[PDB]
Design an enzyme around this catalytic site. Sequence first.
Site, mmCIF file in Angstrom:
data_model
loop_
_atom_site.group_PDB
_atom_site.id
_atom_site.type_symbol
_atom_site.label_atom_id
_atom_site.label_comp_id
_atom_site.label_asym_id
_atom_site.label_seq_id
_atom_site.Cartn_x
_atom_site.Cartn_y
_atom_site.Cartn_z
ATOM 1 N N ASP A 1 -41.712 -7.900 10.954
ATOM 2 C CA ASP A 1 -40.998 -7.774 12.222
ATOM 3 C C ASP A 1 -40.623 -9.160 12.743
ATOM 4 O O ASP A 1 -41.456 -9.852 13.346
ATOM 5 C CB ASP A 1 -41.884 -7.073 13.236
ATOM 6 C CG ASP A 1 -41.206 -6.885 14.580
ATOM 7 O OD1 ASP A 1 -39.986 -7.118 14.652
ATOM 8 O OD2 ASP A 1 -41.900 -6.501 15.557
ATOM 9 N N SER B 1 -23.447 -14.663 18.011
ATOM 10 C CA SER B 1 -22.349 -14.211 17.178
ATOM 11 C C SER B 1 -21.020 -14.593 17.812
ATOM 12 O O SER B 1 -20.889 -14.678 19.033
ATOM 13 C CB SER B 1 -22.440 -12.698 16.985
ATOM 14 O OG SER B 1 -21.293 -12.197 16.337
#
Length: 330
Positions: A35, A199
Amino acid sequence: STGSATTTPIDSLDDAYITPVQIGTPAQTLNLDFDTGSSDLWVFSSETTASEVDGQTIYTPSKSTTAKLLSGATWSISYGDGSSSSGDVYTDTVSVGGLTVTGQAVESAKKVSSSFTEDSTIDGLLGLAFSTLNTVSPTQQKTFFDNAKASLDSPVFTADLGYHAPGTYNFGFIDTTAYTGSITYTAVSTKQGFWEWTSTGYAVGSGTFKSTSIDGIADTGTTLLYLPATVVSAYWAQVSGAKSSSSVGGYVFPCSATLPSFTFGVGSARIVIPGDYIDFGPISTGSSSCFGGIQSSAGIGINIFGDVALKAAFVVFNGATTPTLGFASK
């Protein structure tokens, strides 16, 4: 040193991925959910409330000659899906794919919430976010990656998650046969303890690319892709019959649909998520309403590049003095 381990989807939807981990002496092998959005290595154990164990493999520290109680240490964690776990702490030897750390904090669950009990395939979590998020008190503990870093050939790990197929976690090296083209690296902020990056934009299907900054985290422990409501609305508007359902808890779409791809920007590069990766199947057994793999982050407080996005790429988690993230197509 290096390590290399295969990671395998837990079910036919790729809801999560498990990777075998050797703990203790002699080794006890548990299948852990790696994770990158948390920083605790915790396991089902001989100390877990018996009624909360349903099929998992347990760590029994008393059978490990290298286990030592970390005196006074406790842990307690709550995840973004509302699940939680807590317990006490041992140090022991932990190996992943041939890479061994001695003295790793292994957090032994005394209690786990229902969603963990109900998932017999996940024996615990291995956190790979930054150690500043580790919950052990009163002495915070380091992640497996943090402990191994100095010994690794290169201070990196890579995630290569498969679509309906096994994939690989590598530690300490970049397998140049595992991706196509070049790897595009992008800056990371560690201020929130996550692999947080920006992004450069998105496209829906064959549509034009929209240049816009989207701050989010690379999180192998989250199944879906959570993005701003504007972006998610633009995606689902291209799917006939798709709608946001408050009763189901997100966007659903007709199971008869063919979904468009979704592209996200990494610098000047582009990662394409095929439409099929966005199909999470019937909302309930036999339903013709299917659950979408792209969902709004509006209620979360952060955008999450979960497995839906990451499994379309070969992803480098670069833990150099200034961390960065790398993405390549594959």
